[PDB]
């Protein structure tokens, strides 16, 4: 019942591995597609002149063509926001993967964000110009990154804080609703009409740290058995910019053990099927408090011929969602939030592949495979993040 501004999201888990929206930048407008990333705060892309940039959906943003672009030069060799001064410009630098770096320079210009009901919000933004991209940036279709995290004291004003400072008619809330193909970013609150039904209720979880999107996960259950070797709160970044949900190797190895069992590549191979049916509560090292629920899945995966192909890294893909078990993450109190297979599995070709990976460098992340088929509600002012199952809008990329 609030006032909501809605923006179309494009992408998917398998082909793009992220979700992006379009943004007008400069004067006159240069449309730039940006990866929606709640795990970062910058807004960067390549710029005309880049001598090592990928081929993206748009050309590099052309400063000389924007009547209103202003390169942040360092006078006296001193940059604001404790930035570095290189070759007479305030440096933009990033590190990702294993030492890869995109370097460049900061500049400013007009950014315009329009909803699909034609409501326009404009403001000047500090942004980075990629003059050098590497690794995964050399082969993603999207042109840049739109960081969605909050502004720190005496830091570069971020897109989200500028958006709301220039839209006082909107409550300080934005929702991300991603489906298998494309999604929707909502500014001003969430749409209850997307909530499955009459409409279900939002689960609210306070955020552990301020300025960041961390929440505490105090347990992850499969078949009624917590696979987390600790009930202490595990801080996990609610990150729209990571394709998959990442977890500590202990929790992953204990989950992938039961997914491996449920993965049968040939339903007529006796050794494979025999090896799995000859399993009992006492052969797990982790007895299943709902071992019958486990048996239920296994029998049904063999009954309905839900075959499973393993791909790179030993990631399982099933023919059907039917059979795969629900997962339950434990939040504040003892509230168990259901994590359905249509979220943690993603569509690859015709199968459903596991979208749960090991954490890299003690960085547990609730990624897009946790977003999918939910509304993820960022209540900036109350320092809480909400989750509700929803029929998220869908937008094939041939509608842009
Ligand atoms: C999960 N995750 C992410 N959340 N965002 C990242 C990204 C997202 C994505 F869809 C595709 C490629 C990406 F590089 C980006 N990134 C960052 N992190 C903290 C400050 C800054 C960044 C960052 C901003 C812009 C350009 C390059 C970088 Cl490096 C870290 C990356 C990452 O691994
Ligand atoms: C969540 O935050 C509010 C406001 O700070 C506080 O009153 C409430 O007790 C918190 N709840 C939990 C479970 O931390
Ligand atoms: C399996 O073992 C756990 C723990 O001992 C128990 O709670 C559960 O009921 C057992 N299930 C079966 C089918 O034996």
Coordinates of C-alpha atoms and ligand atoms in Angstrom, one line a residue:
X1 CA 0.0 0.0 0.0
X2 CA 3.1 2.2 0.0
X3 CA 4.5 3.9 -3.2
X4 CA 6.6 1.4 -5.1
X5 CA 9.0 2.0 -7.9
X6 CA 9.7 -1.2 -9.9
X7 CA 12.7 -2.0 -12.2
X8 CA 13.1 -5.0 -14.4
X9 CA 16.0 -7.4 -13.7
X10 CA 17.5 -9.6 -16.4
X11 CA 19.6 -12.8 -16.2
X12 CA 19.7 -16.3 -14.7
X13 CA 21.8 -18.6 -12.7
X14 CA 23.2 -20.7 -15.6
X15 CA 23.8 -18.5 -18.6
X16 CA 24.5 -15.1 -17.1
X17 CA 25.3 -16.2 -13.5
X18 CA 23.9 -12.9 -12.2
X19 CA 21.1 -10.4 -12.6
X20 CA 21.4 -7.0 -14.1
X21 CA 19.4 -3.8 -14.8
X22 CA 19.8 -0.8 -17.1
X23 CA 20.9 2.6 -15.9
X24 CA 21.2 5.9 -17.8
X25 CA 24.4 7.7 -17.2
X26 CA 25.8 11.0 -18.5
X27 CA 24.3 13.9 -20.5
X28 CA 22.9 12.9 -23.0
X29 CA 22.0 9.5 -21.5
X30 CA 24.2 6.6 -22.1
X31 CA 22.4 3.4 -21.1
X32 CA 24.6 1.0 -19.1
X33 CA 23.6 -2.5 -17.9
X34 CA 24.9 -3.2 -14.4
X35 CA 25.1 -6.3 -12.2
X36 CA 22.9 -5.9 -9.1
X37 CA 25.3 -6.6 -6.3
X38 CA 24.3 -6.1 -2.6
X39 CA 27.8 -7.5 -1.7
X40 CA 29.6 -4.3 -2.8
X41 CA 29.2 -0.5 -2.8
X42 CA 30.9 0.8 -6.0
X43 CA 29.4 1.6 -9.4
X44 CA 32.0 1.0 -12.0
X45 CA 32.3 0.0 -15.7
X46 CA 34.8 0.3 -18.5
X47 CA 35.2 3.7 -20.2
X48 CA 36.2 4.8 -23.7
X49 CA 40.0 4.3 -24.2
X50 CA 40.3 1.1 -22.1
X51 CA 43.1 -0.9 -23.6
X52 CA 42.1 -4.2 -22.0
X53 CA 38.3 -4.5 -21.5
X54 CA 35.9 -7.2 -22.4
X55 CA 33.2 -7.0 -25.0
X56 CA 30.0 -6.2 -23.0
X57 CA 26.4 -5.5 -24.0
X58 CA 27.3 -1.8 -24.4
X59 CA 30.3 0.2 -25.4
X60 CA 32.6 1.7 -22.7
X61 CA 31.0 4.8 -21.3
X62 CA 32.4 7.8 -23.2
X63 CA 33.3 10.7 -20.9
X64 CA 34.2 13.1 -23.7
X65 CA 30.6 12.5 -24.9
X66 CA 29.0 13.4 -21.6
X67 CA 28.5 17.1 -21.2
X68 CA 28.4 16.6 -17.4
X69 CA 31.2 14.1 -16.6
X70 CA 34.0 15.3 -14.3
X71 CA 37.2 13.2 -13.8
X72 CA 38.3 13.3 -10.2
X73 CA 41.9 14.7 -10.5
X74 CA 44.2 14.9 -7.5
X75 CA 45.3 18.5 -6.9
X76 CA 48.6 18.7 -4.9
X77 CA 48.6 14.9 -5.0
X78 CA 45.8 14.5 -2.4
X79 CA 42.6 12.6 -3.1
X80 CA 39.4 12.7 -1.0
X81 CA 38.1 9.6 0.7
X82 CA 41.6 8.4 1.4
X83 CA 42.0 7.5 -2.3
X84 CA 45.3 7.1 -4.1
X85 CA 46.7 9.5 -6.7
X86 CA 48.2 7.7 -9.7
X87 CA 49.3 9.5 -12.9
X88 CA 47.4 12.5 -11.8
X89 CA 44.0 10.8 -11.1
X90 CA 42.3 9.4 -8.1
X91 CA 42.7 5.6 -8.5
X92 CA 40.0 3.1 -8.9
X93 CA 41.2 -0.4 -8.1
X94 CA 39.6 -3.8 -7.3
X95 CA 40.8 -7.3 -6.6
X96 CA 38.9 -10.5 -7.2
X97 CA 39.4 -14.2 -7.6
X98 CA 43.2 -15.0 -7.0
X99 CA 44.9 -11.7 -7.6
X100 CA 43.0 -10.4 -10.6
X101 CA 42.5 -6.6 -10.6
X102 CA 40.5 -4.1 -12.5
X103 CA 42.2 -0.7 -12.3
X104 CA 41.1 2.7 -13.3
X105 CA 40.2 6.2 -12.1
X106 CA 37.2 7.8 -10.4
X107 CA 35.0 10.3 -12.1
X108 CA 31.5 11.7 -11.5
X109 CA 28.4 12.3 -13.6
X110 CA 24.6 12.2 -13.7
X111 CA 23.0 8.8 -13.0
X112 CA 19.3 8.4 -13.9
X113 CA 17.1 5.5 -12.8
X114 CA 13.7 5.1 -14.4
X115 CA 11.0 2.6 -13.3
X116 CA 8.8 0.9 -15.9
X117 CA 5.9 3.2 -15.0
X118 CA 8.2 6.1 -16.0
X119 CA 9.1 7.5 -12.6
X120 CA 12.6 9.1 -12.8
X121 CA 15.2 9.7 -10.1
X122 CA 18.4 11.5 -10.9
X123 CA 21.7 12.3 -9.0
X124 CA 25.4 12.8 -9.3
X125 CA 27.4 9.7 -8.4
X126 CA 31.1 8.9 -7.8
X127 CA 31.9 6.0 -10.2
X128 CA 35.0 4.1 -11.3
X129 CA 36.2 3.8 -14.9
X130 CA 37.7 0.4 -15.8
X131 CA 40.8 1.0 -17.8
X132 CA 41.8 -2.6 -17.2
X133 CA 39.6 -5.7 -16.7
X134 CA 40.7 -9.2 -16.0
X135 CA 39.5 -12.8 -15.6
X136 CA 35.7 -13.1 -15.2
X137 CA 35.2 -9.5 -16.3
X138 CA 36.6 -10.3 -19.7
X139 CA 33.6 -12.6 -20.5
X140 CA 30.4 -11.4 -18.8
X141 CA 27.8 -9.8 -21.0
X142 CA 26.9 -7.1 -18.5
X143 CA 28.8 -3.8 -18.8
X144 CA 29.5 -3.1 -15.1
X145 CA 28.6 -3.5 -11.4
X146 CA 25.9 -1.7 -9.4
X147 CA 26.9 -2.0 -5.7
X148 CA 23.9 -2.0 -3.4
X149 CA 25.5 -1.8 0.1
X150 CA 25.2 1.3 2.3
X151 CA 27.4 4.3 2.7
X152 CA 29.9 4.3 5.6
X153 CA 30.7 7.5 7.5
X154 CA 32.9 9.8 5.5
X155 CA 32.8 7.4 2.6
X156 CA 31.8 7.6 -1.0
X157 CA 28.0 8.0 -1.1
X158 CA 26.6 4.8 -2.5
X159 CA 23.8 4.3 -5.0
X160 CA 21.2 3.2 -2.5
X161 CA 21.7 6.2 -0.2
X162 CA 21.6 8.6 -3.1
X163 CA 18.5 7.0 -4.5
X164 CA 16.6 7.4 -1.3
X165 CA 18.0 10.9 -0.5
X166 CA 16.5 12.0 -3.9
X167 CA 13.2 10.0 -3.5
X168 CA 11.9 11.1 -0.1
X169 CA 8.5 9.9 -1.3
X170 CA 9.8 6.3 -0.9
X171 CA 10.2 4.5 2.4
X172 CA 13.8 3.4 2.9
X173 CA 13.3 -0.2 1.7
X174 CA 14.3 -2.1 -1.4
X175 CA 13.3 -5.6 -2.4
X176 CA 14.9 -8.0 -4.8
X177 CA 12.6 -10.7 -6.4
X178 CA 14.5 -13.0 -8.7
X179 CA 12.9 -15.9 -10.6
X180 CA 14.6 -18.5 -12.8
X181 CA 14.7 -15.9 -15.6
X182 CA 15.0 -12.2 -14.7
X183 CA 13.4 -10.6 -11.7
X184 CA 12.4 -7.3 -10.2
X185 CA 14.0 -4.7 -7.9
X186 CA 11.5 -2.7 -5.9
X187 CA 12.2 0.6 -4.2
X188 CA 9.8 1.7 -1.4
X189 CA 8.9 -1.6 0.2
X190 CA 7.7 -4.9 -1.2
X191 CA 4.7 -6.1 -3.2
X192 CA 2.4 -8.3 -1.2
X193 CA 0.7 -9.4 -4.4
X194 CA 3.9 -11.4 -5.2
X195 CA 3.6 -13.3 -1.9
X196 CA 2.3 -16.8 -2.5
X197 CA -1.0 -17.5 -0.9
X198 CA -4.3 -15.3 1.8
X199 CA -0.7 -14.0 1.4
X200 CA 1.9 -15.5 3.6
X201 CA 3.9 -13.5 6.3
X202 CA 7.4 -12.1 6.1
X203 CA 10.2 -13.6 8.3
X204 CA 12.3 -10.8 9.7
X205 CA 16.0 -11.2 10.8
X206 CA 18.0 -8.5 12.3
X207 CA 21.4 -7.7 10.7
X208 CA 24.5 -8.4 12.7
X209 CA 26.7 -5.5 11.5
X210 CA 25.7 -2.0 10.5
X211 CA 26.4 -0.7 6.9
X212 CA 26.6 -4.4 5.8
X213 CA 24.0 -7.1 5.0
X214 CA 25.1 -9.9 7.3
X215 CA 22.7 -12.1 9.2
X216 CA 23.4 -15.0 11.7
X217 CA 22.5 -18.5 10.6
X218 CA 22.6 -20.8 13.7
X219 CA 21.9 -24.1 11.9
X220 CA 21.2 -25.9 8.7
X221 CA 19.1 -29.0 8.7
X222 CA 18.6 -31.8 6.2
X223 CA 16.1 -34.5 7.1
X224 CA 15.7 -33.0 10.6
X225 CA 19.4 -33.1 11.3
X226 CA 21.6 -30.0 11.7
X227 CA 24.7 -30.4 9.5
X228 CA 26.3 -27.3 11.0
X229 CA 29.0 -28.4 13.6
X230 CA 28.1 -25.3 15.6
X231 CA 25.0 -23.6 16.9
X232 CA 26.8 -20.3 17.3
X233 CA 25.7 -17.7 14.8
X234 CA 27.4 -18.0 11.4
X235 CA 27.5 -14.6 9.8
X236 CA 26.4 -14.9 6.2
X237 CA 26.4 -12.1 3.6
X238 CA 23.0 -11.7 1.9
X239 CA 24.7 -11.2 -1.5
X240 CA 22.8 -10.8 -4.8
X241 CA 26.1 -10.6 -6.6
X242 CA 27.2 -14.2 -6.0
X243 CA 25.7 -16.9 -8.2
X244 CA 25.6 -19.6 -5.5
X245 CA 25.3 -20.0 -1.8
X246 CA 28.6 -20.7 -0.2
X247 CA 29.1 -22.5 3.1
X248 CA 32.0 -23.8 5.2
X249 CA 33.5 -27.0 3.9
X250 CA 32.2 -29.0 7.0
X251 CA 28.6 -28.2 6.3
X252 CA 29.1 -28.7 2.5
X253 CA 30.8 -32.1 2.8
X254 CA 28.0 -33.3 5.1
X255 CA 25.3 -32.1 2.7
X256 CA 26.9 -33.3 -0.5
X257 CA 27.2 -36.8 1.1
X258 CA 23.4 -37.1 1.0
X259 CA 23.0 -35.4 -2.4
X260 CA 25.5 -37.9 -3.8
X261 CA 23.4 -40.7 -2.4
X262 CA 20.3 -39.2 -4.0
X263 CA 22.2 -38.9 -7.4
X264 CA 21.8 -42.1 -9.4
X265 CA 23.0 -41.8 -13.0
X266 CA 21.7 -45.2 -14.1
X267 CA 18.6 -46.5 -12.5
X268 CA 19.3 -50.0 -13.9
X269 CA 22.9 -50.3 -12.6
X270 CA 22.7 -52.9 -9.8
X271 CA 25.9 -52.0 -8.0
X272 CA 25.0 -48.3 -7.9
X273 CA 21.4 -48.9 -6.7
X274 CA 22.5 -51.7 -4.4
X275 CA 25.2 -49.6 -2.8
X276 CA 22.5 -47.0 -1.8
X277 CA 19.6 -49.3 -0.7
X278 CA 22.0 -51.2 1.6
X279 CA 22.3 -48.1 3.9
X280 CA 21.1 -47.8 7.5
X281 CA 21.0 -45.3 10.2
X282 CA 24.2 -46.8 11.7
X283 CA 26.3 -46.3 8.6
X284 CA 26.3 -42.5 8.4
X285 CA 28.5 -41.1 11.2
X286 CA 25.7 -38.6 11.3
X287 CA 22.4 -40.5 12.0
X288 CA 19.4 -38.9 10.4
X289 CA 16.8 -37.8 12.9
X290 CA 14.3 -38.3 10.0
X291 CA 15.9 -41.3 8.4
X292 CA 12.5 -42.4 7.1
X293 CA 12.1 -39.0 5.4
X294 CA 15.5 -39.8 3.8
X295 CA 14.3 -43.2 2.7
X296 CA 11.2 -41.5 1.3
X297 CA 13.3 -39.3 -1.0
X298 CA 15.5 -42.1 -2.1
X299 CA 12.7 -44.5 -2.9
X300 CA 10.8 -41.8 -4.8
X301 CA 13.9 -40.8 -6.8
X302 CA 14.2 -44.4 -7.9
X303 CA 10.5 -44.8 -8.4
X304 CA 9.9 -41.8 -10.6
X305 CA 13.2 -42.4 -12.4
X306 CA 14.6 -39.0 -11.3
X307 CA 18.0 -39.6 -12.9
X308 CA 21.0 -37.4 -12.2
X309 CA 24.0 -36.3 -14.2
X310 CA 27.1 -35.1 -12.5
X311 CA 29.0 -32.2 -14.2
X312 CA 32.2 -30.3 -13.5
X313 CA 33.3 -30.3 -9.8
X314 CA 31.0 -33.2 -9.1
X315 CA 27.8 -31.1 -9.1
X316 CA 24.6 -33.0 -9.3
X317 CA 21.8 -32.3 -11.7
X318 CA 18.4 -34.0 -11.5
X319 CA 15.6 -34.4 -14.1
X320 CA 12.9 -33.3 -11.7
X321 CA 12.5 -31.2 -8.5
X322 CA 10.2 -34.0 -7.2
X323 CA 11.8 -35.9 -4.4
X324 CA 14.7 -33.6 -3.5
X325 CA 14.5 -32.6 0.2
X326 CA 13.6 -29.3 1.8
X327 CA 16.4 -27.6 3.6
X328 CA 16.0 -25.5 6.8
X329 CA 18.2 -22.7 8.0
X330 CA 17.8 -21.7 11.6
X331 CA 17.5 -18.0 12.3
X332 CA 16.8 -16.0 15.5
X333 CA 15.0 -18.0 18.1
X334 CA 14.3 -21.5 16.8
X335 CA 12.5 -20.4 13.7
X336 CA 13.3 -22.8 10.8
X337 CA 12.9 -21.2 7.4
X338 CA 12.2 -23.6 4.6
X339 CA 14.7 -23.6 1.7
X340 CA 12.9 -25.3 -1.2
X341 CA 14.6 -27.2 -4.1
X342 CA 13.3 -24.7 -6.6
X343 CA 15.6 -22.2 -4.9
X344 CA 18.8 -24.1 -4.2
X345 CA 18.6 -25.9 -7.5
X346 CA 18.8 -23.9 -10.7
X347 CA 17.8 -24.7 -14.3
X348 CA 20.7 -25.8 -16.5
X349 CA 19.6 -27.0 -19.9
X350 CA 16.7 -29.3 -18.8
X351 CA 18.0 -30.5 -15.4
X352 CA 18.2 -29.0 -11.9
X353 CA 21.7 -28.6 -10.7
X354 CA 22.8 -28.1 -7.1
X355 CA 23.5 -24.4 -6.5
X356 CA 25.4 -24.8 -3.2
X357 CA 29.2 -24.4 -3.1
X358 CA 32.0 -24.4 -0.6
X359 CA 32.9 -21.0 0.9
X360 CA 36.0 -19.4 -0.4
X361 CA 38.3 -17.9 2.3
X362 CA 35.9 -18.1 5.2
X363 CA 33.3 -16.1 3.3
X364 CA 29.9 -17.7 3.8
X365 CA 27.4 -16.1 1.4
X366 CA 23.6 -16.4 0.9
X367 CA 23.7 -16.0 -2.9
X368 CA 21.2 -16.0 -5.7
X369 CA 20.2 -19.6 -5.1
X370 CA 18.9 -18.4 -1.8
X371 CA 17.2 -15.3 -3.3
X372 CA 15.5 -17.3 -6.1
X373 CA 11.7 -17.5 -5.8
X374 CA 11.7 -15.3 -2.7
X375 CA 11.3 -11.6 -2.0
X376 CA 14.4 -10.4 -0.1
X377 CA 13.4 -7.2 1.7
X378 CA 16.1 -4.8 2.8
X379 CA 14.6 -2.7 5.6
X380 CA 17.3 -0.1 5.8
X381 CA 15.9 1.9 8.6
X382 CA 15.0 -1.0 11.0
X383 CA 18.3 -2.9 10.3
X384 CA 16.5 -6.1 9.3
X385 CA 16.3 -8.2 6.2
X386 CA 13.0 -10.0 5.4
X387 CA 12.3 -13.2 3.4
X388 CA 9.0 -14.3 2.0
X389 CA 8.2 -16.9 -0.7
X390 CA 6.8 -15.1 -3.8
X391 CA 5.8 -15.5 -7.4
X392 CA 8.5 -13.1 -8.6
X393 CA 8.0 -11.5 -12.0
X394 CA 9.9 -13.0 -14.9
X395 CA 11.6 -11.2 -17.7
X396 CA 13.4 -13.0 -20.6
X397 CA 16.3 -11.0 -21.9
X398 CA 14.5 -10.6 -25.3
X399 CA 12.4 -7.9 -23.5
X400 CA 14.8 -5.0 -23.0
Ligands
LIG1 C1 30.3 -12.4 -4.8 N1 30.9 -11.2 -5.4 C2 30.2 -10.0 -5.3 N2 29.3 -9.9 -4.4 N3 30.5 -9.0 -6.2 C3 31.6 -9.1 -7.2 C4 31.2 -9.6 -8.5 C5 29.8 -9.9 -8.7 C6 29.4 -10.4 -10.0 F1 28.1 -10.7 -10.1 C7 30.3 -10.5 -11.0 C8 31.6 -10.2 -10.8 C9 32.0 -9.7 -9.6 F2 33.3 -9.4 -9.5 C10 32.4 -7.7 -7.2 N4 33.1 -7.7 -5.9 C11 33.4 -6.6 -5.2 N5 33.4 -6.9 -3.9 C12 33.6 -5.8 -3.1 C13 34.0 -4.6 -3.5 C14 34.0 -4.3 -4.8 C15 33.7 -5.4 -5.7 C16 33.8 -5.0 -7.2 C17 33.0 -4.0 -7.7 C18 33.1 -3.6 -9.0 C19 34.0 -4.2 -9.9 C20 34.8 -5.2 -9.4 C21 34.7 -5.6 -8.1 CL1 35.8 -6.8 -7.5 C22 33.3 -9.1 -5.5 C23 32.7 -10.0 -6.5 C24 32.1 -11.3 -5.9 O1 32.8 -12.3 -5.9
LIG2 C1 16.1 -6.5 16.5 O1 16.3 -5.1 16.6 C2 15.4 -4.4 17.4 C3 15.8 -2.9 17.3 O2 17.2 -2.8 17.5 C4 15.4 -4.9 18.8 O3 14.5 -4.2 19.6 C5 15.1 -6.4 18.8 O4 15.2 -6.9 20.1 C6 16.1 -7.1 17.9 N1 15.8 -8.6 17.9 C7 16.7 -9.5 17.9 C8 16.2 -10.9 17.9 O5 17.9 -9.3 18.0
LIG3 C1 18.4 -42.6 13.6 O1 19.2 -42.2 14.7 C2 18.8 -41.0 15.3 C3 19.8 -40.7 16.4 O2 20.1 -41.8 17.1 C4 17.3 -41.1 15.9 O3 16.9 -39.9 16.4 C5 16.4 -41.6 14.8 O4 15.1 -41.8 15.3 C6 16.9 -42.8 14.1 N1 16.1 -43.3 13.0 C7 15.9 -44.6 12.7 C8 14.9 -44.8 11.6 O5 16.5 -45.5 13.3

